[PDB]
Amino acid sequence: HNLHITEKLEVLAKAYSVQGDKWRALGYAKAINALKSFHKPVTSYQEACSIPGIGKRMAEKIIEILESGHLRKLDHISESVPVLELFSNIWGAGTKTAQMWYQQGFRSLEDIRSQASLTTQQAIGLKHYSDFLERMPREEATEIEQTVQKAAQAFNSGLLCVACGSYRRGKATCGDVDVLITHPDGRSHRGIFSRLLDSLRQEGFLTDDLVSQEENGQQQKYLGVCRLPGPGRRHRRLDIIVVPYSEFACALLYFTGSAHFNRSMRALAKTKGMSLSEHALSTAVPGRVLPTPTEKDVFRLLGLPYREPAERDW
DNA sequence: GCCG
DNA sequence: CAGTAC
DNA sequence: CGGCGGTACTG
Ligand SMILES: Nc1ncnc2c1ncn2[C@H]1C[C@H](O)[C@@H](COP(=O)(O)OP(=O)(O)OP(=O)(O)O)O1
Ligand SMILES: [Mg+2]
Ligand code: NA
Ligand code: NA
């Protein structure tokens, strides 16, 4: 973890991202990672241009930060960028909505509150704006997962509940809590969302819903808001997925991430004429589902050594 | 932005 | 669907 | 030249 050039590239990357240039931002992201994972601090355009994820343009940027101490592009970042970042940090608003609000003359969250048309999701995002930008201590994510597990296992004690995401990857803090739920009998997972969510509502634990198709008996996810009881508590984002046991390993792998790790893994599967998703590991263009009873089986079928969750924190 |  | 989200 | 993971809600 030994480069200073990435600090400058990070600003450009974020600038491109909030302005909607998502593929250019991805290229910066991959390069920033390539720079982060190099041994010696790069000192040559040739040395830089050799690195995978770094091309002529990125090398030149590097060759300027080394031989000048600065990146000229950083002085010509659009003035809109910090406001675009402010707006897209509202949950449920992305770059398109942020750019529309900016075009309409809005410059602050007060402008948004008083003058913007907000979706139901965005109104919830705005009212929890600071809280959703916080990370919680690992210990708090444990309490939240346990709250969900207790409510679930009260209804069916055979239900398996696992906190995934950054929590399973062992991080000291968590942006939210990601809970996977399944049942080993392969059937009793069906239709339980209404039951589980109603239970968590009865005791006031859930405070708002963001994404929750409860009219669908095949509902796959709940994205919402919770808050533990007592003083000193903030509102926290809570994501729940309910999956068939036959998809456990792929769902676990997906939900544990990281996101970058998932993208890398799926890209690798595609090179081998396979396809990897939260549902299954399959073959080429419908395709054949491969047997993956455990995460280790997914690595194996892809010709990879098993990585522990903590080693997937890419 | 990068890569094939 | 486009947007936003995981 | 043109894709870059693959998928699930919302309105
Ligand atoms: N774009 C994505 N593509 C594929 N998988 C994703 C994507 N985004 C999120 N996931 C998967 C992997 C993530 O680890 C998991 C949970 O998402 P998320 O809660 O945003 O991240 P996280 O739990 O890893 O970190 P954080 O602490 O910020 O919440 O869902
Ligand atoms: Mg998370
Ligand atoms: Na947002
Ligand atoms: Na709903």
Separation between the CA of A42 and the C1’ of C6 (whole angstroms): 35
A271 nearest nucleotide via C1' and CA:
B4
Q: How far apart are CA A303 and CA A290, in angstroms?
A: 14
Q: Going by C-beta distance under 8 Å and a sequence separation of 6 or more, which residues neighbour residue A52?
A: A34
Distance from residue A136's CA to the centre of ligand 3 (Å): 19
Answer whether A49's CB lies under 8 Å from A55's CB: yes
Residues A183, A158: contact at Cβ < 8 Å?
yes
Residues with CB under 7 A from strand D: A 23, 26-27, 119-121, 209, 211-213, 216, 218-221, 254, 259, 262-264, 266-267, 269-270, 275-279
Q: Is the dihedral of CA A118, A119, A124, A125 positive or negative?
A: negative
- Residues A275 and A268: beta-carbon distance below 8 Å: no
CA of residue A268 relative to chain centroid, distance:
20
- Over its C-alpha atoms, chain A yields an Rg (Å, rounded) of 22
The DSSP secondary-structure symbol of A105 reads: T
Q: What is the distance between the alpha carbons of residues A284 and A301, in angstroms, rounded to a whole number?
A: 14
Between the alpha carbon of residue A127 and those of residues A119, A132, A249, the distances in Å are: 12, 10, 36
Provide the β-strand partners of residue A142.
Answer: none
Residue A28 exposure: Cα atoms within 13 Å on the Cβ side: 19
For chain A, the straight-line distance linking the first and the last C-alpha, in angstroms and rounded, comes to 13
Looking up tokens 């809970």 gives A179
Q: What gap in Å lies between CA A53 and CA A13, rounded to an integer?
A: 14
- Residue A179 forms beta bridges with which residues? A163, A240
Q: State if residue A174 touches ligand 1 by the CB under 6 angstroms criterion.
A: yes
Chain breaks in chain A (C to N over 2.5 A) after: 285
Q: How far apart are CA A249 and CA A127, in angstroms?
A: 36
DSSP A291: P
Catalytic residues of A: 61
A231 CA from C2 C1′ (Å): 41
Domains along the sequence of chain A with CATH: 1-80 (1.10.150.110), 81-134 (1.10.150.20), 135-257 (3.30.460.10), 258-314 (3.30.210.10)
Closest to A209 in 3D by CA, of A89, A91, A90: A91
Measured between alpha carbons, how far is A198 from A201 in angstroms, rounded to an integer?
5
DSSP notation for A176-223: SEEEEEE-TTSSTTTT-HHHHHHHHHHTT-EEEEEE--TT-TT--EEE
Question: Distance (Å, rounded) from C-alpha A286 to C-alpha A277?
Answer: 14
Q: What technique was this entry resolved by?
A: X-ray
A105 sits in the region (left: phi over 0; alpha: psi -120 to 50; else beta) called left
Segments in A19-119 forming alpha helices (H): 22-36, 45-50, 56-66, 81-88, 95-103, 109-115
Binding residues of A for dCTP: 135, 166-169, 175-178, 262
Q: Resolution, in Å, please? A: 1.8
Entry field: residues in chain A? 314
